Design an enzyme around this catalytic site. Structure first.
Site, PDB file in Angstrom:
ATOM      1  N   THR A 172       1.019  -1.014  -0.427  1.00 42.89           N
ATOM      2  CA  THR A 172       0.128  -0.009  -0.191  1.00 42.89           C
ATOM      3  C   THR A 172       1.080   1.213  -0.486  1.00 42.89           C
ATOM      4  O   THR A 172       0.589   2.142  -0.639  1.00 42.89           O
ATOM      5  CB  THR A 172      -0.824   0.159   1.348  1.00 42.89           C
ATOM      6  OG1 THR A 172      -1.569  -1.398   1.472  1.00 42.89           O
ATOM      7  CG2 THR A 172      -2.318   1.015   1.475  1.00 42.89           C
ATOM      8  N   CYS A 237      -3.173  -6.060  13.661  1.00 43.79           N
ATOM      9  CA  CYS A 237      -4.077  -6.003  14.020  1.00 43.79           C
ATOM     10  C   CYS A 237      -5.356  -7.114  14.616  1.00 43.79           C
ATOM     11  O   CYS A 237      -6.471  -6.755  14.147  1.00 43.79           O
ATOM     12  CB  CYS A 237      -4.707  -4.956  13.725  1.00 43.79           C
ATOM     13  SG  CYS A 237      -5.325  -4.254  12.336  1.00 43.79           S
TER      14      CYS A 237
HETATM   15  N1  LIG Z   1       7.145 -11.455  11.350  1.00 44.10           N
HETATM   16  C1  LIG Z   1       5.917 -10.104  10.058  1.00 44.10           C
HETATM   17  N2  LIG Z   1       6.675 -10.228   8.975  1.00 44.10           N
HETATM   18  C2  LIG Z   1       6.700  -9.147   8.282  1.00 44.10           C
HETATM   19  N3  LIG Z   1       5.299  -9.173   7.534  1.00 44.10           N
HETATM   20  C3  LIG Z   1       4.310  -9.725   8.502  1.00 44.10           C
HETATM   21  C4  LIG Z   1       4.800 -10.732  10.262  1.00 44.10           C
HETATM   22  N4  LIG Z   1       3.765 -11.409  10.671  1.00 44.10           N
HETATM   23  C5  LIG Z   1       2.486 -10.642   9.765  1.00 44.10           C
HETATM   24  N5  LIG Z   1       2.757  -9.823   9.071  1.00 44.10           N
HETATM   25  C6  LIG Z   1       1.899  -9.519   8.067  1.00 44.10           C
HETATM   26  O1  LIG Z   1       1.999  -8.046   8.237  1.00 44.10           O
HETATM   27  C7  LIG Z   1       0.334  -7.522   7.944  1.00 44.10           C
HETATM   28  C8  LIG Z   1       0.082  -6.982   9.303  1.00 44.10           C
HETATM   29  S1  LIG Z   1      -0.750  -5.469   9.146  1.00 44.10           S
HETATM   30  C9  LIG Z   1      -0.735  -5.066   7.178  1.00 44.10           C
HETATM   31  C10 LIG Z   1      -1.526  -3.729   6.751  1.00 44.10           C
HETATM   32  C11 LIG Z   1      -0.449  -2.970   5.492  1.00 44.10           C
HETATM   33  N6  LIG Z   1      -0.128  -1.588   5.561  1.00 44.10           N
HETATM   34  C12 LIG Z   1      -1.463  -3.234   3.695  1.00 44.10           C
HETATM   35  O2  LIG Z   1      -2.102  -2.230   3.828  1.00 44.10           O
HETATM   36  O3  LIG Z   1      -1.541  -4.238   3.808  1.00 44.10           O
HETATM   37  C13 LIG Z   1      -0.814  -9.511   7.433  1.00 44.10           C
HETATM   38  O4  LIG Z   1      -0.375  -8.836   5.872  1.00 44.10           O
HETATM   39  C14 LIG Z   1       0.521 -10.053   8.320  1.00 44.10           C
HETATM   40  O5  LIG Z   1       0.363 -11.777   7.556  1.00 44.10           O
END
Ligand SMILES: Nc1ncnc2c1ncn2[C@@H]1O[C@H](CSCC[C@H](N)C(=O)O)[C@@H](O)[C@H]1O
Ligand SMILES: [Zn+2]
Ligand SMILES: [Zn+2]
Ligand SMILES: [Zn+2]
Ligand SMILES: [Zn+2]
Ligand SMILES: [Zn+2]
Ligand SMILES: [Zn+2]
Ligand SMILES: [Zn+2]
EC number: 2.1.1.37
Lengths: 428, 347, 46
Positions: A172, A237
């Site tokens: 995004t 979240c």
């Molecule tokens: N250890 C990790 N390292 C990287 N990404 C991770 C993670 N654990 C979870 N995530 C991912 O990070 C996101 C959390 S919030 C994602 C929101 C992002 N700004 C957007 O617009 O898509 C999820 O997609 C999740 O799967």
């Protein structure tokens, strides 16, 4: 009970209602209740910060609006309103015989939606959206210094921006940078879920140099991947919100990952004496703990800014933003391209009953062909301001893809935040 | 042949830099840091091993030239920990010198005073720096390593100590004053509201310390929270960039955060934990996991103590009815190298 | 051997593959390798 005795004493005109905390009956009145008439102690402020924007699976509020607690709540029958008033507060502010008679009233409106507006012991304070906006500037318990304002670099000296995006998701941040027309030198993005990786790969044409897990990234990596100009990120979240039925902890899992963002922020920050422009944005959800919020503000050394996407988009997407991006406070402007009604975001042949959406009774928001139906995935993209058909890359299921869309930042909100970075970096 | 060098240099008119003074080898890997001469490759390794190793009472563990702990000559300067050996003093300084030195009992060593005539052994100028450079080029995987401070240039040490007061320990290490009303250590219990402005208001600091509590919980706040608060206030107490002065930091765990939180902590403090046990009769009485930059913190590590035995220790000590005592003596000797960096005094 | 250690350091994402000479592992990277990804030292050019 002490609550109820105190309101009994107030109706005799022996005590002012503004001198008593209407939520829990405490005498320690520091604040005034933002929506309604009465005082407001600090423990009820912390309970109000945690509980006000919590919603059940129903789509309606998890707890009462008045005291943020209660025992049994009364849900509102008005359209698009999700507020709940517990029986114990209506015993006070409306009367001990009017709650029972108001349950019998089948078209029942709540008192924030009451057409009359004024009642005997309870009256609605007039500039309540203004006071709701001022209530998060009222969070001066965590007092800090303002973020350091760097003077603007001349337009001939500007260079393409370099972004370290942690918890990228579906890219995004880079998309919003390309919408603003800023030249991006490189975009390093750590992410784990394959589907989101794939969305970013396809939609941003192999430009993103992808990495593995955030935890593996060392300071050596941060140094060797060039100086970074903009570090952005958002904690998960899924577990942090009350919307997930499986709330085994609160800052197990997600909490750790916030500190991964904290560490790589200190690794990517330029030294004192290196006055080059550097910027950073963290994002989190509003339905969070107070001490959680405190620890985040204290580690990141800043006051959060709440930004609700209702001002610009077709969803109720109220999120905290920590950062030092210039004009993070300034009010949100919705362009004509942004759709402020849900009905404009629908496909043709569909008509919405709602004007704004709550995606995690009326669980499915759309009346098409005299039938209740979920928003289609491409519409959920339209609700958040993504380009049309943004997530149709790989052969993934609808449930997974909706879940992939629902975690993402709201695109016009992130455009509104990233827009003054044009003043600092090169354009296409 | 240690004895042969006296012929080799005198009769064969040969440079000391071409022979190994530490043993008498003729093939030298490099030169000796503290004194004039070469040094061979096994002696180089032996030296780097022993480098900052001290004893429990306070003095250096091995012989400062050759790293022989077998025989030791204690120097008679209260501000000098350098201990020697007999074989060197007679080999390098002439045939009957170590017994005279032993009979003096008020003998300042070579690094203390050079005024005394020396037979062959010459003291290198600037030798503190030469030592640092030697460690840099000659250690495999060199670490955060600061030049040793000349004794008159040694200022009193400024300590921040989070969640555990170390005034008693370091005063007993002579590092802190018993006669001062202005305290040279700032103990803080609760750091929750603390801002970078606050740690800066409290002055600059030389040493930062922070430790998780023992098993008897004073509060319910989870053991990761202490670690992260330590990391933050540690980043606050860092000296302003461009500072040549020596800054140190030491985080201590009393076996109270699990492997998952331990992995997180290892990542955030950017090294692996050093386990330092209490072994009595061969039996593991207690143990403690450390992270710090303090010299030779990592050579105190005991790779014999396995993780399963530490889980068993944690289970056995949690289920006892005894009140929890801070394991002072385990981390006490882990401040000894700061003698060579900061101002000592003991009445 | 040294160049194998170098490639090991590259797969950890501590070094770029374009900053190393993939032919012999030399750090004197003047050119890029024409066919594949990596640098190219002048001796390897000859
Ligand atoms: N250890 C990790 N390292 C990287 N990404 C991770 C993670 N654990 C979870 N995530 C991912 O990070 C996101 C959390 S919030 C994602 C929101 C992002 N700004 C957007 O617009 O898509 C999820 O997609 C999740 O799967
Ligand atoms: Zn109250
Ligand atoms: Zn209530
Ligand atoms: Zn209503
Ligand atoms: Zn030797
Ligand atoms: Zn010796
Ligand atoms: Zn001495
Ligand atoms: Zn080559």
């Amino acid at each position: 009970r002490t609550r109820e005795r105190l309101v009994y004493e107030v109706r005799q005109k022996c005590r002012n209602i503004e001198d008593i905390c209407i939520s829990c009956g405490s005498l320690n009145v520091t604040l005034e209740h933002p929506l309604f008439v009465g005082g407001m102690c600090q423990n009820c402020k912390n309970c109000f910060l945690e509980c006000a924007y919590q919603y059940d699976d129903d789509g309606y509020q998890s707890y009462c609006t008045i005291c943020c607690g209660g025992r049994e709540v009364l849900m509102c029958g008005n359209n698009n309103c999700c507020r709940c008033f517990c029986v114990e507060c209506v015993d006070l502010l409306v009367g001990p015989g009017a709650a029972q008679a108001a349950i019998k009233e089948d078209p029942w409106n709540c008192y924030m939606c009451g057409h009359k507006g004024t009642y005997g012991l309870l009256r609605r304070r007039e500039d309540w959206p203004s006071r709701l906006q001022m209530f998060f500037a009222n969070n001066h318990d965590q007092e800090f210094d303002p973020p350091k304002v760097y003077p603007p670099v001349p337009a001939e000296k500007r260079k393409p921006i370099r972004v370290l995006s942690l918890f990228d998701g579906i890219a995004t941040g880079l998309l919003v940078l390309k919408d603003l027309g800023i030249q991006v030198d490189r975009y390093i993005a750590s992410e784990v879920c394959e589907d989101s990786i794939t969305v970013g790969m396809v939609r941003h044409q192999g430009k993103i140099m992808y990495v593995g897990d955030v935890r593996s990234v060392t300071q050596k990596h941060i140094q060797e991947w060039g100086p970074f100009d903009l570090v952005i990120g958002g904690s998960p979240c899924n577990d942090l919100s009350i919307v997930n039925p499986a709330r085994k902890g609160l800052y197990e899992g997600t909490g750790r990952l916030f500190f991964e963002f904290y560490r790589l922020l200190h690794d990517a920050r330029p030294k004192e004496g290196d006055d080059r422009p550097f910027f950073w944005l963290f994002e989190n959800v509003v339905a969070m703990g107070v001490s959680d919020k405190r620890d985040i503000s204290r580690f990141l050394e800043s006051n959060p800014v709440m930004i609700d996407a209702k001002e610009v988009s077709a969803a109720h997407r109220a999120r905290y933003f920590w950062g030092n991006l210039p004009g993070m406070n300034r009010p949100l402007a919705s362009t004509v391209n942004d759709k402020l009604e849900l009905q404009e975001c629908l496909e043709h042949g569909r008509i919405a009953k709602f004007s704004k959406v709550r995606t995690i009774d009326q669980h499915f928001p759309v009346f098409m062909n005299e039938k209740e139906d979920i928003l289609w995935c491409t519409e959920m993209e339209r609700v958040f301001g993504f380009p049309v058909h943004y997530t149709d890359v790989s052969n993934m299921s609808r449930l997974a893809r909706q879940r992939l869309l629902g975690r993402s930042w709201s695109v016009p909100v992130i455009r509104h935040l990233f827009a003054p970075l044009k003043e600092y970096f090169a354009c296409v | 042949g240690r004895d042969l060098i006296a012929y080799e240099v005198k009769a064969n008119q040969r440079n000391i830099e071409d022979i190994c003074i530490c043993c008498g080898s003729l093939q030298v890997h490099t030169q000796h840091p503290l004194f004039e001469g070469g040094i061979c490759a096994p002696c180089k390794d032996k030296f780097l091993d022993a480098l900052f190793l001290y004893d429990d009472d306070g003095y250096q563990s091995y012989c400062s030239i050759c790293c022989s702990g077998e025989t030791l000559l204690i120097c008679g300067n209260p501000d000098c920990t350098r201990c020697y050996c007999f074989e060197c003093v007679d080999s390098l300084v002439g045939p009957g010198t170590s017994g005279k030195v032993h009979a003096m009992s008020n003998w300042v060593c070579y690094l203390c005073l050079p005024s005394s005539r020396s037979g062959l052994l010459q003291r290198r100028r600037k030798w503190r720096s030469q030592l640092k450079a030697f460690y840099d080029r000659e250690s495999e995987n060199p670490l955060e390593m600061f030049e040793t401070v000349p004794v008159w240039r040694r200022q009193p040490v400024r300590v921040l100590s989070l969640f555990e007061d170390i005034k008693k320990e370091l005063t007993s290490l002579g590092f802190l004053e018993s006669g001062s009303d202005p305290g040279q250590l700032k103990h803080v219990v609760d750091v929750t509201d603390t801002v970078r402005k606050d740690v800066e208001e409290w002055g600059p600091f030389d040493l930062v310390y922070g430790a998780t509590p023992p098993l008897g919980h004073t509060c319910d706040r989870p053991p990761s929270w202490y670690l992260f608060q330590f990391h933050r206030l540690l980043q606050y107490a860092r000296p302003k960039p461009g500072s040549p002065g020596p800054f140190f930091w030491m985080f201590v765990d009393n076996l109270v955060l699990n492997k998952e939180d331990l992995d997180v902590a290892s990542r955030f403090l950017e090294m692996e934990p050093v386990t330092i046990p209490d072994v009595h009769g061969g039996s593991l009485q207690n143990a403690v996991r450390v992270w710090s930059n303090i010299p030779a913190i990592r050579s105190r590590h005991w790779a014999l103590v396995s993780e399963e035995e530490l889980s068993l220790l944690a289970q056995n000590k949690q289920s006892s009815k005894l009140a929890a005592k801070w394991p002072t003596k385990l981390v006490k000797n882990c401040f000894l190298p700061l003698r060579e960096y900061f101002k000592y005094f003991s009445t």
